[PDB]
């Protein structure tokens, strides 16, 4: 499956997707692709569109 993630981090901000077999293992992703970035913020997940946000 497709994922995306939406960043609101105070620096960085935008929009990527990632593919992955499922949620657990596209939020670990995810989580190393923000930090790498900088980003330290709340995260959601939402199934029905799914979608990861993260915001500092």
Same mark, same amino acid.
């Given at each position: 499956? !497709? &994922? *995306?993630?939406?960043? %609101? $981090? *105070? @620096?960085?901000?935008?929009? !990527? !997707?990632?593919? +992955?077999?499922? +949620? =657990? /293992? +596209?939020? *670990?992703?995810? *989580?190393? &692709? =923000? %930090?790498? %970035? $900088?980003?330290?913020?709340?995260? @959601? &997940?939402?199934? +029905?569109?799914?979608?990861?946000?993260? /915001?500092?």
């Amino acid at each position: 499956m !497709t &994922y *995306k993630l939406i960043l %609101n $981090g *105070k @620096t960085l901000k935008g929009e !990527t !997707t990632t593919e +992955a077999v499922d +949620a =657990a /293992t +596209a939020e *670990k992703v995810f *989580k190393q &692709y =923000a %930090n790498d %970035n $900088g980003v330290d913020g709340e995260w @959601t &997940y939402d199934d +029905a569109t799914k979608t990861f946000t993260v /915001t500092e």
